[PDB]
Design an enzyme around this catalytic site. Sequence first.
Site, short mmCIF file in Angstrom:
data_model
loop_
_atom_site.label_atom_id
_atom_site.label_comp_id
_atom_site.label_asym_id
_atom_site.label_seq_id
_atom_site.Cartn_x
_atom_site.Cartn_y
_atom_site.Cartn_z
N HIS A 72 10.42 -7.07 -8.54
CA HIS A 72 9.69 -7.13 -7.29
C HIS A 72 8.27 -6.57 -7.39
O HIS A 72 8.03 -5.36 -7.23
CB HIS A 72 10.45 -6.43 -6.16
CG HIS A 72 9.94 -6.78 -4.80
ND1 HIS A 72 10.50 -7.78 -4.03
CD2 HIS A 72 8.89 -6.30 -4.08
CE1 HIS A 72 9.85 -7.88 -2.89
NE2 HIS A 72 8.86 -7.00 -2.89
N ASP B 184 6.27 -3.02 -6.30
CA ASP B 184 5.74 -3.76 -5.12
C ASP B 184 4.25 -4.14 -5.17
O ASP B 184 3.90 -5.26 -5.58
CB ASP B 184 6.13 -3.11 -3.77
CG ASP B 184 6.52 -4.14 -2.71
OD1 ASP B 184 6.93 -5.26 -3.11
OD2 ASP B 184 6.45 -3.92 -1.49
N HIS C 103 12.48 -10.96 1.14
CA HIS C 103 12.10 -9.66 1.71
C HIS C 103 12.92 -9.50 2.99
O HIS C 103 12.78 -10.31 3.91
CB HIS C 103 10.60 -9.62 2.06
CG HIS C 103 9.70 -9.20 0.93
ND1 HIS C 103 9.44 -10.01 -0.16
CD2 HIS C 103 8.95 -8.08 0.76
CE1 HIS C 103 8.59 -9.39 -0.97
NE2 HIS C 103 8.29 -8.22 -0.44
N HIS D 246 4.05 -7.91 -6.41
CA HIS D 246 3.12 -8.89 -5.83
C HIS D 246 1.79 -8.92 -6.61
O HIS D 246 1.07 -7.91 -6.68
CB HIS D 246 2.80 -8.55 -4.36
CG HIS D 246 3.99 -8.47 -3.44
ND1 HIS D 246 4.43 -9.54 -2.70
CD2 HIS D 246 4.78 -7.42 -3.10
CE1 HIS D 246 5.46 -9.17 -1.97
NE2 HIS D 246 5.70 -7.89 -2.19
N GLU E 216 13.75 -4.01 4.84
CA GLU E 216 12.76 -2.98 4.51
C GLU E 216 12.42 -2.15 5.74
O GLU E 216 12.69 -0.95 5.81
CB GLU E 216 11.50 -3.63 3.91
CG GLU E 216 10.42 -2.67 3.45
CD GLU E 216 9.12 -3.38 3.08
OE1 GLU E 216 9.11 -4.63 3.06
OE2 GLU E 216 8.12 -2.67 2.82
N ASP F 177 -0.92 -10.31 -5.62
CA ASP F 177 -1.75 -9.88 -4.50
C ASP F 177 -2.10 -8.41 -4.60
O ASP F 177 -3.23 -8.00 -4.33
CB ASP F 177 -0.95 -10.01 -3.19
CG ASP F 177 -0.74 -11.44 -2.76
OD1 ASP F 177 -1.76 -12.15 -2.67
OD2 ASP F 177 0.40 -11.91 -2.45
N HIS G 172 13.70 -5.26 -1.19
CA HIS G 172 13.87 -3.97 -0.54
C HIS G 172 15.34 -3.78 -0.10
O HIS G 172 16.19 -3.33 -0.89
CB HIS G 172 12.90 -3.83 0.64
CG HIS G 172 11.46 -3.65 0.25
ND1 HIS G 172 10.94 -2.44 -0.14
CD2 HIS G 172 10.42 -4.52 0.28
CE1 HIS G 172 9.64 -2.57 -0.37
NE2 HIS G 172 9.31 -3.82 -0.12
ZN LIG Z 1 7.33 -6.72 -1.50
#
Ligand SMILES: [Zn+2]
Lengths: 352, 182
Positions: free
Chosen positions: A12, A292, A211, A14, A214, A16, A235
């Site tokens: 997991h 993450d 996702h 990203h 979380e 981004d 999560h």
């Molecule tokens: Zn995430």
Amino acid sequence: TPAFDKPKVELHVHLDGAIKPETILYYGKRRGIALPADTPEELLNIIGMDKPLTLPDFLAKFDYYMPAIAGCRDAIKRIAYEFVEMKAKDGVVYVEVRYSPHLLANSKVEPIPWNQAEGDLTPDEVVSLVNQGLQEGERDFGVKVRSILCCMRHQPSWSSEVVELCKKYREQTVVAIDLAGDETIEGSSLFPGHVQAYAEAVKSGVHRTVHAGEVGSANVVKEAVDTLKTERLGHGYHTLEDTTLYNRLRQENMHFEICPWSSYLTGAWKPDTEHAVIRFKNDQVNYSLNTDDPLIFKSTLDTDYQMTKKDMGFTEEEFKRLNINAAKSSFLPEDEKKELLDLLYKAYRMPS
Amino acid sequence: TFLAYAQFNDTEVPLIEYSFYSDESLQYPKTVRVPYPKAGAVNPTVKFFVVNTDSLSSVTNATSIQITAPASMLIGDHYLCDVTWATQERISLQWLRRIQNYSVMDICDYDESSGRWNCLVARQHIEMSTTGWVGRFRPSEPHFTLDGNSFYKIISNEEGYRHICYFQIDKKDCTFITKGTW
Ligand SMILES: [Zn+2]
Ligand SMILES: *[C@@H]1O[C@H](CO)[C@@H](O[C@@H]2O[C@H](CO)[C@@H](O[C@@H]3O[C@H](CO)[C@@H](O)[C@H](O[C@H]4O[C@H](CO)[C@@H](O)[C@H](O)[C@@H]4O)[C@@H]3O)[C@H](O)[C@H]2NC(C)=O)[C@H](O)[C@H]1NC(C)=O
Ligand SMILES: *[C@@H]1O[C@H](CO)[C@@H](O[C@@H]2O[C@H](CO)[C@@H](O)[C@H](O)[C@H]2NC(C)=O)[C@H](O)[C@H]1NC(C)=O
Ligand SMILES: *[C@@H]1O[C@H](CO)[C@@H](O)[C@H](O)[C@H]1NC(C)=O
Ligand SMILES: *[C@@H]1O[C@H](CO)[C@@H](O)[C@H](O)[C@H]1NC(C)=O
């Protein structure tokens, strides 16, 4: 000290949120995109949190840098590559990276994002660039890398394309479909465009993670497993609010992609509680340790292992088995899953 | 069918300036000024495009298709240093890092359904040197077979002698077809 100095597996993370300050800064200057700083190091602070704020203030960090990266081919292929390197700089031996291809395009996009102008870079080509950025990292930095294409919760319109891209680029490193963005949007998980995509995923053999849990009720999890048919859970903390579903999930061997340092900083874990994880450890559940968005969390994957070893007495025997788990739950063909385990077993020293 | 071209951005390349005097009729000397990067100064940056001359409009601006550099090249200054067509629909490109001891070849195919150029990373070919720089003055040019699935290229062997090597588009090694002290 390298909290757990062995090979690791990460599921997991990203793209981004795993970019280099220096290279954001470079494309800022090149494109004349305004930026709230001028030092690379001064920037990691303005973009990074160390006080555990909340999901509104977290998503606000994206706005500082993403305009500098999106729509810019040269930049994409870069960060994808530079990312693989930073994984090699942690223990990592295999990674699955997620991002939204639409969030990086500037042409052919439902609501053109990041308030950028039209428009040359199509999402189909973003995905293509990324692959190549990763292939070139896998080769050069020596960590096997696969990618996960994200659907976005508030945009069911896109999620059709996402799965379709997942399909054609199955040769070029994409192995699964995700769904990130915002759990707490009312009845998101049921939006027809989303669920039909996941239906096609099941239909076409595209693996599935979501996702969920979380910051959101245990029910968000229920929706993800039941109608969405997720094979894995992003999560997934607040699934411990429904002991029936939780225990039937352990039964059916569900995988929980955990982001410890993430949780603290997103505020999805109120620090008064035992972390959702220590229970998972004690319950012998199928789970993995991830990072993450390491850029915004000012973190390496070592930060998440430092946290669990210190804060909650995680032993190396535990670290070893959850990585075995992560590998078992990974979206590799049967094939390479075997040899990932082999690499792991050998490094550690158990039966293979 | 296709016209490929390079584009050079010299925005921050500093200028060399010098006087030019011309015919004695010219009352004040002209200052010639030229973008020229001295050693270690700021270099030009390059981009590469291909356009289809068969689908030109006269009612639309032409679509130029970019082929980005390899990612390994993009992390710092580099050069485009060779372009050689291989087939009607395949083009080969050689890039070189500003530290000219590492270079990469891309092999790109036209993609019917997309209308862009796919550069399969599987088809890349790294070339580097530990004792000096790549090539005599730059990486050598490839010569392809008619079907464009293999090519010959002069590369330095491990005894340090420049000989003809034989490549398969996707197989990562090559075979020397000559050796010797020459
Ligand atoms: Zn995430
Ligand atoms: C050649 O390479 C050079 C790189 O040096 C490059 O020149 C640069 O162009 C960028 C991109 O246009 C320039 O930045 C622009 O500057 C103007 C005026 O100062 C801005 O108004 C531009 O538009 C932005 O304006 C706002 C910025 O927050 C927003 O409205 C919006 O985000 C717009 O994007 C933009 O900032 C930059 O000034 C130069 N670089 C320098 C410092 O020389 C040129 O693009 C390259 N040419 C080619 C063909 O590649
Ligand atoms: C020159 O080569 C080009 C590139 O292959 C040829 O153009 C293709 O023509 C065939 C039709 O016979 C189509 O399959 C492709 O769609 C064409 N490519 C495009 C879109 O440009 C061409 O046949 C060759 N000869 C010419 C026209 O002079
Ligand atoms: C083509 O591009 C130029 C500059 O961007 C623009 O001024 C011109 O109007 C364009 N022509 C057409 C047909 O749109
Ligand atoms: C290129 O040469 C320089 C100078 O000796 C050196 O820094 C580097 O090791 C070389 N790099 C490669 C990839 O050969």
